[PDB]
Amino acid sequence: AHEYHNWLRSPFSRYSATCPNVLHSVMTLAAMLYKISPVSLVLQTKAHI
Amino acid sequence: TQNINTVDMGLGYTSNTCVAYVNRVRTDMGVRVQDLFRVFPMNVYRHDEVDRWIRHAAGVERPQLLDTETISMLTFGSMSERNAAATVHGQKAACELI
Amino acid sequence: AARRIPHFYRVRREVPRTVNEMKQDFVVTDFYKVGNITLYTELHPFFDF
Amino acid sequence: MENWSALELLPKVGIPTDFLTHVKTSAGEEMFEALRIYYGDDPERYNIH
Amino acid sequence: ANIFCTFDHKLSIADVGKLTKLVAAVVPIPQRLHLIKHYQLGLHQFVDHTRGYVRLRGLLRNMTLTLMRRVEGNQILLHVPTHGLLYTVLNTGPVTWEKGDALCVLPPLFHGPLARENLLTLGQWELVLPWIVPMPLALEINQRLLIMGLFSLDRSYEEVKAAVQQLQTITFRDATFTIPDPVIDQHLLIDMKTACLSMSMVANLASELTMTYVRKLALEDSSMLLVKCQELLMRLDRERSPDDEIARLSALFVMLRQLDDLIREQVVFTVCDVSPDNKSATCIFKG
Amino acid sequence: EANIFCTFDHKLSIADVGKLTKLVAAVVPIPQRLHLIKHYQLGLHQFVDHTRGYVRLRGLLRNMTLTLMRRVEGNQILLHVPTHGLLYTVLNTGPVTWEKGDALCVLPPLFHGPLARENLLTLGQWELVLPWIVPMPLALEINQRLLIMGLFSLDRSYEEVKAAVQQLQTITFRDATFTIPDPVIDQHLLIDMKTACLSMSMVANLASELTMTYVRKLALEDSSMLLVKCQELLMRLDRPQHVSPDDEIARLSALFVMLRQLDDLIREQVVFTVCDVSPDNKSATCIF
Amino acid sequence: FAATHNPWASQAGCLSDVLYNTRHRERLGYNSKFYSPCAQYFNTEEIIA
Q1: C-alpha distance from E51 to closest chain B C-alpha (Å)
Q2: What is the DSSP letter of E85?
Q3: How many degrees, rounded to 5, is the angle at CA E161 between CA E156 and CA E165?
Q4: What domain of life does the UniProt record list for this protein's source (chain C) (predicted)?
Q5: B interface mutation test: which of E72, E254, E256, E257 has the most B CBs within 10 A?
């Protein structure tokens, strides 16, 4: 248990337990993992995400 | 050289101004968000090829050669951006908060 | 021409892409911004220079 | 050019010239044909040739 | 050419009684106006946290400097000196003057001092006068601050700490000062940092440009000075496109032009007979 | 001894003396410093010679004395040598905007661009060309930039030097444009570069072993923009053991005097420093 | 009567309180001549003093 050094913090496991199974929740588990790099930020905003 | 000097002879506040009439604005109610690269010229990313990438995809040109404007900007405080060519609106103004 | 199609890939230098691909990286409310560097090459609707 | 000592030495007519804008604005925006401003009090009126 | 100055705040009688002791001393002011408010007067408007002392020297070099003459009700008779005629001053510097030296003017180094200018303060304002020190001590203490700042980047070792403690002391005639560090808590002040950076990088630019320019120069008429120049360069080395060299040479000149508050110490006075207690001295204003 | 009279072989018409009476308190140099002079040595047109060098004129006008023109009444121009210290009023025709703090140095008049080249007095073989009064940063930039033209361009073809100095001749200082027309490579340039080479070799040799590695330590420690500039400028060819306090003191003294004898080639002693500028940027009241 | 309607701004040491306080801006090497209109809302040494 090195929770502040992992790459998946508490809200990922908080979100996995309460989701449905209609193949959109797997897309949300995917796209919660967009990084928060400045390069990731300019790439995300540069397509109006 | 004259030198007047006044004595206030009022108990409370004996003179009231009121904001009366608006002639015009001087800003533009604009959306030109604040260019933080011209406010903080000291900071870059510590790794190269990601500093030049951010300055490539962030619309701001890189200072190529070392001019005395660059060292008076990094040391002292002066007018970083220049006044543009065409201003039919007026003075520009915005800021940013997360 | 078909037999030396590996003989370009033995040397492994990256090629910078055309500006025609720099154009179509953008969304329709961003093509008229100051950051679009492909405005000095889009002149005419019929002859892209 | 038009000598301004003939303005400065010759006796002039007093008049309430009330024009609507500032005088230095009407100078610096060249509403008049030929201005001659001095911000001091120059002695060039006195060299009477 | 006489100047005036007025204080907006209430000025007591003790503040005048401690200010009029400073009846003839230098007070530099930013602009030669005929009437100037007191916030601009002095050097309190310039000090802050991040910037240090070399900034104060650089802005004081280009600043005009005047002489305080008399006091009145709430107008202060500042008086700008003229080149050639002679005046009287006082000694706010901590060194006893003697005959015929050349005084310099440098910013005072006791920022937050034990003297605190006699509590001659107003609301968020305080008066401060620059030191008036003769020239050998002036460029001496300039070198002392400089090589105190050079050692500041690797100070974890202990013999360099004792070297810095040696540098913090000073000697003169009956004079001991303790000039504090530019470094406080593992970081440097930005103007001191850019000063030592400018001189170290103009030294490096010389070290990697002279080996090009002895060959780019020596294909003209050679001299014995030129072969001894390459002898110096070659002993230094054996001891171990236009676009880049144009930037190297431009950066060379513009970065050596940032030491101009260090490489030239310009004299501002010539001492005449001095007084007993060595606090006052008639003098000739130069420059 | 204070007032210098002059004369012309022509006479002076009302149009010409009306052109000239506008130039009260204008600066005019004198090659000789004698009591009575002729107008064929007044000004600078005795010494102008194109395809000889703008730098020769920069070294020559630096050597003349300076005067101020006033009180013209017919065959008397009355140049007046300024004493050392009193407040004078001057007048500039060189189009540069001024500032209350900036000092002044004299430069030969470079061409400005419009092909006007105003001479304001035209005689049979002699026009009157006038010295420029310019602020101190433009004077330092002119001196360092033509020294860059001299030092950079040895052993090169005309093509890359043309492409470099076509953009290096331009100085955009206070919304103007400028050009340095004749940087020609004279013996004066060769002795200037020889002193520069000697001073650079001295500060490369007798500097410390710890000042060479200061920016390397800031590269290993800190990260700024000009640090990235220094790494791109020096990185291509890539515990203190020795400590010595007093040897470092003498080393910095030698480094200082050799930096000063490098800096002397571009930094002239100032000739004027203002107290006020006229707000239409014509005259100024300066002390020297 | 709530705690804080923007928890990345109010409490001492956020991104904006370190980004706009003139103390932390002077530490971070800022241009003193640029105006940023949020600077009057984020000081304390003008406010709590």
Answers
A1: 9
A2: -
A3: 155
A4: Viruses
A5: E254
| Distance, CA of E17 to CA of B45 (rounded, Å) | 56
DSSP B4-64: -------SS-------------SS--------TTTT--S---SSTTTHHHHHHTTT-----
Does residue E249 sit in helix, strand or coil?
helix
Across E60-99, b (16+ Cβ under 10 Å) vs e yields beebbbbbbeeeeeebbebbbbeeeeebebbbbbebebee
| Cβ–Cβ below 8 Å for C29 and A48 | yes
Q: Looking at chain G, how many residues does it have? A: 49
In sequence order, the β-bridge partners of residue F286 are: F88, F274
Residue F197, amino acid = C
CB contact under 8 A, B57 and A38: no
Out of D37, D40, D47, the one facing F21 most closely (by C-beta) is D47
**Interchain proximity G33–B34, CB inside 8 Å:** no
How near does any CA of chain B get to the CA of G10, in Å? 11
Q: Whose CA is closest to F274, among F148, F143, F7, F92?
A: F92
Contact predicate F138/F96, CB 8 Å: yes
- Angstrom distance (rounded) from CA E84 to CA E102: 14
Structure determination method: cryo-EM
DSSP β-bridge partners for residue E282: E88
Structure tokens given for E145: 């601050």
Q: Which residue of G has its CA nearest to E191?
A: G29
Is D49's CB within 8 Å of F278's CB? no
